[PDB]
Amino acid sequence: NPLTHSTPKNFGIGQAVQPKRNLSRYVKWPEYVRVQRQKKILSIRLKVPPTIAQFQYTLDRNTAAETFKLFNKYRPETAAEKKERLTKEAAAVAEGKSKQDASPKPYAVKYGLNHVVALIENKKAKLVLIANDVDPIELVVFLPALCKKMGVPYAIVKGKARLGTLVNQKTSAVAALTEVRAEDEAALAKLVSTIDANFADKYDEVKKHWGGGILGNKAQAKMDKRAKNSDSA
Amino acid sequence: KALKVRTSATFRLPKTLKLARAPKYASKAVPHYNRLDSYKVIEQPITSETAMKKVEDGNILVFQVSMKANKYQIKKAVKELYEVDVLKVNTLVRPNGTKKAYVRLTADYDALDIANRIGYI
Amino acid sequence: GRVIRNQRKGAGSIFTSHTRLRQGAAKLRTLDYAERHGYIRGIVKQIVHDSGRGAPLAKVVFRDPYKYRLREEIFIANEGVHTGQFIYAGKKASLNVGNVLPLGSVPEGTIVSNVEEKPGDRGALARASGNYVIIIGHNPDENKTRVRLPSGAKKVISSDARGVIGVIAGGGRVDKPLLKAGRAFHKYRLKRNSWPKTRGVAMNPVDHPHGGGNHQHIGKASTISRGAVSGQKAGLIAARRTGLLRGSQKT
Amino acid sequence: RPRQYATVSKTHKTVSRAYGGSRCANCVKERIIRAFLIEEQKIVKKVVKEQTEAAK
Amino acid sequence: GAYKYLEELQRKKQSDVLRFLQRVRVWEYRQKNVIHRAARPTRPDKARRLGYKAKQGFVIYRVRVRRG
RNA sequence: UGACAUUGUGAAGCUUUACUUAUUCAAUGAAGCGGAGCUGGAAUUCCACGUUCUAGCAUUCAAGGUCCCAUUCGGGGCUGAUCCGGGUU
RNA sequence: AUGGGGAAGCUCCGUUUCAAAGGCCUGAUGCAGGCCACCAUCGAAAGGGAAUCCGGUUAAGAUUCCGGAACCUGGA
């Protein structure tokens, strides 16, 4: 106390050297990072047509949790469990002399774009979930309209990583349930009448609605300031 | 959760882990034997009249040396082939294209002695 | 016909400038935050001669706002700038000779020099010896100012473009007649090899449009069109009028 | 010559004073005088500004 | 499968959705290098038609050349 | 020089004006942009929001303040240096 | 050259720029850890440049060898 002094440094324009502040906003990010951010910016600035803007609508943090909880019980067999099933079947074919009905009928979420599309077309799909962030969005742009025309409930779900962890993969565009058990029939029934409520019911009104046109902050502030002082003119 | 604080606007490549090679096979089957051992560096002496004068008076041996050898190699090679310490080595390139090395031994060895020990008087 | 001299001068080779002895590029400070909001103070360490340039350069030491270093900037000296003088560059600097101010922060009739053509670069207009720009007027509505250039031309530029107060110094340099050809030789020895010039009318007809003939005469009109291709632009290019003025022709 | 300064003792390359082998004695005196005088002027200007601030 | 849908939809180059997708992807391709590794084909259906198979050892590069 | 393509989005009446994302120009080691908020002055509005006799000095994640663990002889957070948007301008 | 960008192409522009471009001090390949942001390289036997002189010596060597006497650099 008697020796240590308070010397508040003057950090003005011409005073002492400016301290090391946070320059995270001005970082010259790499080319790939700049391409990422400017692609998102451009894609949200340009007027996204309705058939793409309808993917901005996803399940809420509750319906998504409920749906993934339902599908977790129907995650397909892993490699080790299929191998164990093959040991059981190898025992059964030699001993019991039977192949079908030697194991209980499988009940798992169907996945794969080329499989779920055929299921939807044949109307065997009880419920379908679509990843909202596939890189060639053309893979699933037609899926909601196909679902609506085939009379099958679809949900533009959040994240293909969740679908991948569902189907024991890294990524999976679409995950479909086609044969659910009587125990979970009530759960699926409650899932629908809500999923189609926020997705399928509103399809005919999201088909007429474009999106995008969300200016940046520095232009939105300018537009607000121009709307003011001119509304009262 | 907030993003990392950055005190410099210049983004730099992070220093990742660098591995060391563990090849599945050796680069070559067998390591090469010593390419410039003593018997390759010290080729033969020179016994011209001037070289004889140098060995008799200056306590200097004169050796023909391969062009790929340097003063350290010549010193070590002489020390190995003929057990005498050398005081200095002076190398030149003869106009016929071969190294000529004047190896001056220490004061306590006789060039005229070890020359006739080698075989040339 | 052969590629004429003026045609040959664009490819470089021997027609590049002789930039060995130049002290450096004469430029102002970068439009930093400090300079564009308030002002920063530098000290005129030394005024030096720049080879191939009539106006003396001034070297001003500026403290670095974001680092210890001493950013030494090679200004163009203004008549009045001296060693040991403090140069205040920025928007909040007071209006004295040698200070750099944005053109929106100076009153009308002000004499400036080394004027920025557009806010952000480092000086474009009125940098030759004895030359200056007059602040004709302002326009805060569009953030512009109108100025009068050395060539008598009126220009409008963003009010945040900077410009040093005063005149470029070294004025009247062209008053003294170079007596000897050697004076011009040494003048252009540091300038781009543009001397001595052989008259095209003395050239052979292959080497120049004016060449040839049993008398040294041009032969056709020397007022060459603006749209004439390269190699025909020898003489008076896009000449609206010719001959001696014989009139007031403004001041 | 520039390299020979490496081979000689520190005594031959400096003068026993602040800015020993870099600035002249008179320049050192002038900059000491400047430092003291205009630091005191800074203090005086701060005092004047502080007393004028209350003149509201 | 979805490939019939993809190969029929891609034939509508002038549709609004494809126009928007093209206007975004052309900007990306201009931003990236003249020749650069493309991780996955933009048109997987067309890649399959031309001979691509999403397995190891099949490489897709993206290239831009000057028109005219 | 004209048309077609990149080339998109709006208004007001062939015309004018408007928008940033395409594209174009320039600079910096992408350092302080935009919006908001304090603080005083003028007067809800606007303004500034640490530096001008002098050829000195200005660096150690900053001293102070405050809160933790260890206090070790040390380490750490906040403030000092207002908040929000990551559009470098 | 590289990053880049042109060019059918041999190659061209470009030399720090539309780049995620590294080596220095350590105490021990992280590192205690820190440091720095400069920018491949080539380019002079007359430019800059670490330090050697005398006497003697050969058929022909020499500020190089011999005798003597010094200095510089690097490192223990």
Curated annotation (Swiss-Prot), chain B:
Residue location of crosslink Glycyl lysine isopeptide (Lys-Gly) (interchain with G-Cter in SUMO): K40
MF terms in GO: RNA binding; rRNA binding; structural constituent of ribosome
Quaternary organization: Component of the large ribosomal subunit (LSU). Mature yeast ribosomes consist of a small (40S) and a large (60S) subunit. The 40S small subunit contains 1 molecule of ribosomal RNA (18S rRNA) and 33 different proteins (encoded by 57 genes). The large 60S subunit contains 3 rRNA molecules (25S, 5.8S and 5S rRNA) and 46 different proteins (encoded by 81 genes). uL23 is associated with the polypeptide exit tunnel.
Location(s), subcellular: Cytoplasm
Gene Ontology CC terms: cytosol; cytosolic large ribosomal subunit; preribosome, large subunit precursor
Name of the protein in its database record: Large ribosomal subunit protein uL23
Similarity comment text for this entry: Belongs to the universal ribosomal protein uL23 family.
Superkingdom of this protein's organism: Eukaryota
Gene label: RPL25
Family matches, as InterPro entries: Nucleotide-bd_a/b_plait_sf (IPR012677), Ribosomal_uL23-like (IPR013025), Ribosomal_uL23/eL15/eS24_sf (IPR012678), Ribosomal_uL23_CS (IPR001014), Ribosomal_uL23_N (IPR005633)
Extent of the signal sequence: none
Alphabetical list of PANTHER family matching this protein: 60S RIBOSOMAL PROTEIN L23A
One Pfam family linked to the record: Ribosomal_L23
Organism encoding this protein: Saccharomyces cerevisiae (strain ATCC 204508 / S288c)
Curated annotation (Swiss-Prot), chain C:
One of the protein's GO biological processes: ribosomal large subunit biogenesis
Residue numbers bearing the Phosphoserine modification: S51, S94, S158, S159, S248
InterPro entries for the chain: NA-bd_OB-fold (IPR012340), Rib_uL2_dom2 (IPR014722), Ribosomal_uL2 (IPR002171), Ribosomal_uL2_C (IPR022669), Ribosomal_uL2_CS (IPR022671), Ribosomal_uL2_dom3 (IPR014726), Ribosomal_uL2_RNA-bd_dom (IPR022666), Translation_prot_SH3-like_sf (IPR008991)
Single annotated GO MF: RNA binding
GO cellular component, one term: cytosol
Keyword Ribosomal protein: yes
Domain of life: Eukaryota
Compartments it resides in: Cytoplasm
Keywords, in A-Z order: Cytoplasm, Isopeptide bond, Phosphoprotein, Ribonucleoprotein, Ribosomal protein, RNA-binding, rRNA-binding, Ubl conjugation
Chain positions of cross-link Glycyl lysine isopeptide (Lys-Gly) (interchain with G-Cter in ubiquitin): K45, K92, K118, K144
Classification via Pfam families: Ribosomal_L2 (PF00181), Ribosomal_L2_C (PF03947)
Chief location bin: cytoplasm
Coiled-coil regions listed: none
Transcription regulation recorded as keyword: no
SMART domains: Ribosomal_L2, Ribosomal_L2_C
Subunit note: Component of the large ribosomal subunit (LSU). Mature yeast ribosomes consist of a small (40S) and a large (60S) subunit. The 40S small subunit contains 1 molecule of ribosomal RNA (18S rRNA) and 33 different proteins (encoded by 57 genes). The large 60S subunit contains 3 rRNA molecules (25S, 5.8S and 5S rRNA) and 46 different proteins (encoded by 81 genes).
Family: Belongs to the universal ribosomal protein uL2 family.
Other comments on record: There are 2 genes for uL2 in yeast.
Protein name from the UniProt record: Large ribosomal subunit protein uL2A
Organism of this sequence: Saccharomyces cerevisiae (strain ATCC 204508 / S288c) (Baker's yeast)
Curated annotation (Swiss-Prot), chain D:
Compartment(s) of residence: Cytoplasm
Recorded superkingdom: Eukaryota
Protein task: Component of the ribosome, a large ribonucleoprotein complex responsible for the synthesis of proteins in the cell. The small ribosomal subunit (SSU) binds messenger RNAs (mRNAs) and translates the encoded message by selecting cognate aminoacyl-transfer RNA (tRNA) molecules. The large subunit (LSU) contains the ribosomal catalytic site termed the peptidyl transferase center (PTC), which catalyzes the formation of peptide bonds, thereby polymerizing the amino acids delivered by tRNAs into a polypeptide chain.
Family: Belongs to the eukaryotic ribosomal protein eL34 family.
Further comment found in the protein's record: Present with 23600 molecules/cell in log phase SD medium.
Quaternary context: Component of the large ribosomal subunit (LSU). Mature yeast ribosomes consist of a small (40S) and a large (60S) subunit. The 40S small subunit contains 1 molecule of ribosomal RNA (18S rRNA) and 33 different proteins (encoded by 57 genes). The large 60S subunit contains 3 rRNA molecules (25S, 5.8S and 5S rRNA) and 46 different proteins (encoded by 81 genes).
Name of the protein in its database record: Large ribosomal subunit protein eL34A
Species of provenance: Saccharomyces cerevisiae (strain ATCC 204508 / S288c)
Organism phylogeny: Eukaryota, Fungi, Dikarya, Ascomycota, Saccharomycotina
Included range, full protein: 58 to 113 of 121
Curated annotation (Swiss-Prot), chain E:
Location within or outside the cell: Cytoplasm
Top-level lineage group: Eukaryota
Subunit-level organization: Component of the large ribosomal subunit (LSU). Mature yeast ribosomes consist of a small (40S) and a large (60S) subunit. The 40S small subunit contains 1 molecule of ribosomal RNA (18S rRNA) and 33 different proteins (encoded by 57 genes). The large 60S subunit contains 3 rRNA molecules (25S, 5.8S and 5S rRNA) and 46 different proteins (encoded by 81 genes).
Function field: Component of the ribosome, a large ribonucleoprotein complex responsible for the synthesis of proteins in the cell. The small ribosomal subunit (SSU) binds messenger RNAs (mRNAs) and translates the encoded message by selecting cognate aminoacyl-transfer RNA (tRNA) molecules. The large subunit (LSU) contains the ribosomal catalytic site termed the peptidyl transferase center (PTC), which catalyzes the formation of peptide bonds, thereby polymerizing the amino acids delivered by tRNAs into a polypeptide chain.
Family classification: Belongs to the eukaryotic ribosomal protein eL15 family.
Miscellaneous note of the record: There are 2 genes for eL15 in yeast.
Protein name per the record: Large ribosomal subunit protein eL15A
Organism: Saccharomyces cerevisiae (strain ATCC 204508 / S288c)
